[PDB]
Ligand binder design. Structure first.
Ligand SMILES: CCCCCCCCCCCCCC(=O)OC[C@H](COP(=O)(O)OCC[N+](C)(C)C)OC(=O)CCCCCCCCCCCCC
Ligand SMILES: CCCCCCCCCCCCCC(=O)OC[C@H](COP(=O)(O)OCC[N+](C)(C)C)OC(=O)CCCCCCCCCCCCC
Ligand SMILES: CCCCCCCCCCCCCC(=O)OC[C@H](COP(=O)(O)OCC[N+](C)(C)C)OC(=O)CCCCCCCCCCCCC
Ligand SMILES: CCCCCCCCCCCCCC(=O)OC[C@H](COP(=O)(O)OCC[N+](C)(C)C)OC(=O)CCCCCCCCCCCCC
Ligand SMILES: CCCCCCCCCCCCCC(=O)OC[C@H](COP(=O)(O)OCC[N+](C)(C)C)OC(=O)CCCCCCCCCCCCC
Ligand SMILES: CCCCCCCCCCCCCC(=O)OC[C@H](COP(=O)(O)OCC[N+](C)(C)C)OC(=O)CCCCCCCCCCCCC
Ligand SMILES: C[C@H](CCC(=O)NCCC[N+](C)(C)CCCS(=O)(=O)[O-])[C@H]1CC[C@H]2[C@@H]3[C@H](O)C[C@@H]4C[C@H](O)CC[C@]4(C)[C@H]3C[C@H](O)[C@]12C
Ligand SMILES: C[C@H](CCC(=O)NCCC[N+](C)(C)CCCS(=O)(=O)[O-])[C@H]1CC[C@H]2[C@@H]3[C@H](O)C[C@@H]4C[C@H](O)CC[C@]4(C)[C@H]3C[C@H](O)[C@]12C
Ligand SMILES: C[C@H](CCC(=O)NCCC[N+](C)(C)CCCS(=O)(=O)[O-])[C@H]1CC[C@H]2[C@@H]3[C@H](O)C[C@@H]4C[C@H](O)CC[C@]4(C)[C@H]3C[C@H](O)[C@]12C
Ligand SMILES: C[C@H](CCC(=O)NCCC[N+](C)(C)CCCS(=O)(=O)[O-])[C@H]1CC[C@H]2[C@@H]3[C@H](O)C[C@@H]4C[C@H](O)CC[C@]4(C)[C@H]3C[C@H](O)[C@]12C
Ligand SMILES: C[C@H](CCC(=O)NCCC[N+](C)(C)CCCS(=O)(=O)[O-])[C@H]1CC[C@H]2[C@@H]3[C@H](O)C[C@@H]4C[C@H](O)CC[C@]4(C)[C@H]3C[C@H](O)[C@]12C
Ligand SMILES: C[C@H](CCC(=O)NCCC[N+](C)(C)CCCS(=O)(=O)[O-])[C@H]1CC[C@H]2[C@@H]3[C@H](O)C[C@@H]4C[C@H](O)CC[C@]4(C)[C@H]3C[C@H](O)[C@]12C
Ligand SMILES: C[C@H](CCC(=O)NCCC[N+](C)(C)CCCS(=O)(=O)[O-])[C@H]1CC[C@H]2[C@@H]3[C@H](O)C[C@@H]4C[C@H](O)CC[C@]4(C)[C@H]3C[C@H](O)[C@]12C
Ligand SMILES: C[C@H](CCC(=O)NCCC[N+](C)(C)CCCS(=O)(=O)[O-])[C@H]1CC[C@H]2[C@@H]3[C@H](O)C[C@@H]4C[C@H](O)CC[C@]4(C)[C@H]3C[C@H](O)[C@]12C
Ligand SMILES: [Cl-]
Lengths: 262, 259, 261, 268
């Protein structure tokens, strides 16, 4: 009974609008917390405000949980809001930084933003195949790079994780020649045979992956269209063919009678 | 009387003539670069500039009298208006005005409809993206704060300031020296700085790419709809035509049946 | 005259010329080696002087066969210009290098390759509009950059032509920040207000330019498809409409007859 | 030479069993982790001997497998690319460790791509990607020719004063690829070059434009040309229905137009 009373609140525009306002204010506050000048003067006023908004957010998420019960925790966006507000409550090192992640609540609380993100994410599940294939490709070349170049170049390829970092850098193309491969070729003149293929393969996959998405997305669109049009030509065909038997049966009716009279 | 000026203002001669001054004053702007040239042919120019700015003001004036309020409802006129004003404000103000005066070379886009169409075609995509543009700006702003309070003390040149983390994060997005120049340094002090900048790179590029994939595909969905509605509209017309005909021919037997 | 045409137009003639192109290509790549030229240099230079004659024999014949039609043809003109460059005496060496451009005759002489290039080039004329807009944009910002930064940074913006070069570099994004802008911000802390917009506009246009190509090319395909689909529905629309008349007139001519009887 | 004997059937039941394929895939994953631990100097000092045996084991089983698979599938094995790779890879692994080249010991980690061959999901992903290559070979060739031509020009123009970057044909090739990747093309190469040769930009700016034009436009075509094929496959389907529907009504009317002439014959 009272559940309905508060439910009208939690889901009211006032409730959501008010929260979105605090998110935006606390977002300005956290940018003002950057300034060493600012915190010296108005520091305390902020920290309490920080400690207030987090309280309200804890009130909010509690209500939202009581109103939505388990379906709250089946919701990605609620889960995020939940984690982000929890991390914020852990007592004041690195979490202190991650506390700026509650400004992403502005995405959660605004459906306009939810739609953008959901739209973007939609591609990822199909890609997991390729992502895995790529990670394997990296993992293999990371091992080769370490076994080939980690002896004479330990900072770049001394460790599996370091070859991984360096191979990602090569993929981004940042200083891959002047910075990395030209050095390596002073010692190992054929190092280009390892890193030019790595570039080609990696970039081929990236580009072609998205070519496929665009083309395959197009092919699905042409089918949704083809089925609509053909289904129409198929209804028009079922309509005349229904209206010809009425015309045909009359040459049977107007024959049977007109037959007897002759 | 009024028609005389308007018929003149909008003649091909008028616009072609203004376009002609735009181009000359444009070469002047490029010859004004050379110290050598200015030493010899310098003063000649300043008059030429001061001349064309007079003609342009006449032009802008006439155009306003002819179009009245319609002038200031037009973006391309306002730009021509704003720009030509810049040229008339006294040089020794605010030295930046002396520079922004070359923006009137963009008036070559205003006066040529070919160009006006190119730009308009290009702008057409912007309003759809503002959501994403906003999402990106927020994303930067949040990571700028993290980068500042993570790296600003030991690396104040790059992250000491919110506005500097913004500049540096944009650089990382452009991929320019993001590793050799910045992250590899940072990892000397903070070995786990890659956990912050590799995700940042992935997210940023994923959005940028997929945004344009969406444009291409969603632009296509509309094309397949506009087409689908043309084809189906024909099948629907082809039907009701036959329907009326069968109806008549079915009503025609009723006549013969009665008789 | 017909004898010459049968030769010039034969596969043997074109195939034989293509054979010299590929051969002349290997020697021209072997000319790179100081080792090679020391030993087999003279032998090569004779081959060079040989093939260039044969190509001139070829270019001559081809002109006699086609007359004006030859010089109205791009691919022939290329072979002509190219083979001429090779004939002008080596003496200002720059010509001696452009002589390697006759290896592009391998594209001229191979039709598959001629199709690839033509397919690629086919896009450009539409872009002439945008290229101009871009070139203007560069020219405008090149002027601004020169008179903003050339005083304190002559290497990068001291000259109009130099700001052009440096602004193209920014577009390629190579060292734009560490290399150029961060230095400039030492003197001009608001220099990012000039170079971040320049980056956005440039990349926005390039990307959107190709989005338009893909979608507008897409839209033409949807229209070429419509007419084809509509043209059949309308072929279906007219045949039926007649058969109703073959039925209509047959109903009338019968209904009228039944009336009499 | 089994052919179709009772024991050929014995091998076939093994090679094609779920256990056999699943077991091989399981070894691939373990030997894959093993090679990542072989990276660690600490680990090799302690558990080194354990590894080399396991490596020496998995290579044995994989050789057994490759053999069985050949007996079961005979020539179809060598007409299959994925089998050939499995074969090529495992042979590398069998070449003696300290051979003259001494690099195969590294190429031996390529057997981890075997995780792609044994997984049908992966085979399809790779096949989907490769499917584009043959169409491009024309363009790829056009590009290689372009590089080769510009590589020669770069050597003759800049190799004397700049032997590090263009002294050798193979070096101008490597530097021109770098320019294409846009890595330090200006600050690193062309700005230096212009200290000596101020018009060197006329050589490298076109090269950039042409190179990027082709690369981009190639993929534009793929998207569009692949598209027109989709529009053809579609319209035909629509035509074919609109074209059968035209065959149905046409007979329907004539089957009807003859029935009324059938009624006119009566009176006649
Ligand atoms: C944005 C933005 O400009 O961020 C920087 C400002 C200034 O930092 P701040 O420490 O407040 O004072 C100026 C320091 N100075 C002279 C070294 C720049 O700091 C801020 O404005 C942070 C608050 C922005 C919201
Ligand atoms: O684990 C792999 C590595 C671990 O590296 P790690 O040893 O932790 O590096 C820290 C030490 N440091 C700072 C000196 C490098 O991981 C890293 O630290 C960073 C390596 C990032 C590799 C990203 C490769 C993902 C490929 C995905 C491509 C698919 C896109 C379609
Ligand atoms: C996608 C497929 C990718 C295939 C990856 C192939 C990897 C290529 C291997 C490679 O090029 O690495 C170069 C090195 C050069 O070793 P190396 O020249 O023997 O140096 C010996 C050490 N030294 C100078 C101090 C005596 O290792 C070699 O020795 C290779 C020798 C040329 C082959
Ligand atoms: C979607 C793309 C959105 C990302 C836009 C990135 C904006 C980059 C940016 O530079 O923002 C800068 C402003 C404040 O910069 P500011 O505080 O003026 O100082 C930074 C430059 N400095 C050190 C030379 C003075 O903030
Ligand atoms: C999309 C189209 C984008 C617009 C086209 C790209 C613009 C390319 C312009 C460009 O390449 O600039 C180079 C010329 C050179 O003028 P110039 O001043 O003669 O170069 C000498 C400068 N130096 C000595 C420092 C090397 O200026
Ligand atoms: C699009 C198609 C373009 C493909 C371009 C492929 C890149 C070609 C390339 O990397 O050139 C390298 C080879 C080997 O020449 P090489 O003279 O052995 O250079 C390696 C040794 N070094 C660094 C000391 C000179 O030459
Ligand atoms: C062909 C490649 C690799 C296999 C895979 C990886 C990403 C996959 C696309 C995305 O998943 C988005 C979307 C999901 C829909 O559900 C079905 C359509 C579409 C366009 C997928 C098509 C295809 O499957 C793609 C291109
Ligand atoms: C539509 C016709 C089928 C008849 C087939 C034949 C070749 C196929 C293309 C290639 O497979 C390369 C590439 C694979 C990606 O996965 C999806 C994109 C793309 C461009 C494919 C599109 C489409 O599938 C094509 C045109
Ligand atoms: C789906 C994403 C955002 C999530 C947004 C961001 C940019 C938007 C496109 C542009 O607006 C251009 C164009 C305007 C038409 O009117 C409708 C079609 C189209 C292609 C828009 C589709 C869609 O809206 C896009 C892709
Ligand atoms: C039309 C069909 C189903 C009905 C739906 C199901 C999966 C959807 C695609 C994915 O969502 C990924 C991506 C999201 C972008 O936003 C717009 C582009 C793209 C490629 C979508 C296109 C289209 O919308 C698809 C094919
Ligand atoms: C719309 C933009 C300019 C704004 C212009 C600039 C380049 C033009 C394309 C190319 O010209 C190639 C091709 C020529 C055909 O004729 C018509 C189709 C197509 C795809 C053109 C479409 C459109 O015209 C484009 C995209
Ligand atoms: C066909 C539909 C509805 C009519 C119209 C409405 C808005 C138009 C898009 C935008 O204009 C942005 C952009 C302009 C480029 O020039 C060509 C590409 C693109 C994506 C346009 C495609 C298409 O034209 C759209 C979707
Ligand atoms: C026109 C350009 C080169 C000039 C060549 C190079 C790559 C070729 C495409 C790929 O081969 C994939 C696919 C194979 C199908 O079989 C036919 C369709 C399609 C889309 C090909 C079309 C066309 O052939 C392309 C774009
Ligand atoms: C289909 C219509 C003609 C009817 C022709 C006329 C101009 C042609 C485009 C341009 O040629 C540029 C480009 C060449 C690539 O090869 C394939 C892609 C693209 C976009 C072509 C697509 C298509 O072929 C067009 C629109
Ligand atoms: Cl019909």
């Amino acid at each position: 009974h009272m559940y309905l009373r508060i439910t009208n609140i939690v889901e009211s525009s006032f409730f959501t609008k008010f929260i979105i306002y605090l998110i935006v204010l606390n977002g300005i506050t956290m940018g003002l917390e950057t300034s060493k000048t600012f915190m010296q003067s108005f520091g305390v006023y902020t920290t309490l405000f920080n400690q207030i908004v987090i309280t309200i957010f804890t009130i909010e998420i509690i209500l939202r949980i009581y109103v939505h019960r388990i379906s709250f925790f089946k919701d990605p966006w609620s889960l995020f809001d939940f984690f982000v507000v929890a991390i914020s409550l852990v007592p004041t090192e690195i979490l202190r930084v991650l506390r700026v992640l509650r400004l992403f609540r502005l995405v959660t609380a605004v459906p306009q933003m939810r739609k953008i993100v959901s739209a973007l994410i939609s591609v990822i599940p199909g890609m997991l195949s390729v992502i895995a294939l790529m990670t394997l490709f990296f993992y293999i070349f990371a091992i080769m790079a370490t076994q080939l170049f980690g002896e004479r170049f330990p900072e770049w390829f001394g460790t599996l994780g370091e070859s991984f970092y360096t191979l990602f850098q090569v993929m981004t193309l940042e200083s891959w020649s002047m910075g990395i491969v030209r050095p390596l070729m002073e010692v190992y003149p054929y190092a280009w045979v390892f890193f030019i293929p790595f570039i080609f393969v990696v970039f081929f996959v990236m580009i072609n992956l998205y070519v496929a998405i665009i083309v395959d997305a197009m092919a699905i669109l042409n089918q949704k269209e083809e089925q609509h049009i053909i289904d129409e030509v198929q209804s028009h065909e079922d309509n005349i063919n229904n209206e010809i038997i009425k015309l045909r049966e009359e040459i049977v009716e107007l024959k049977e009678l007109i037959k007897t009279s002759l």
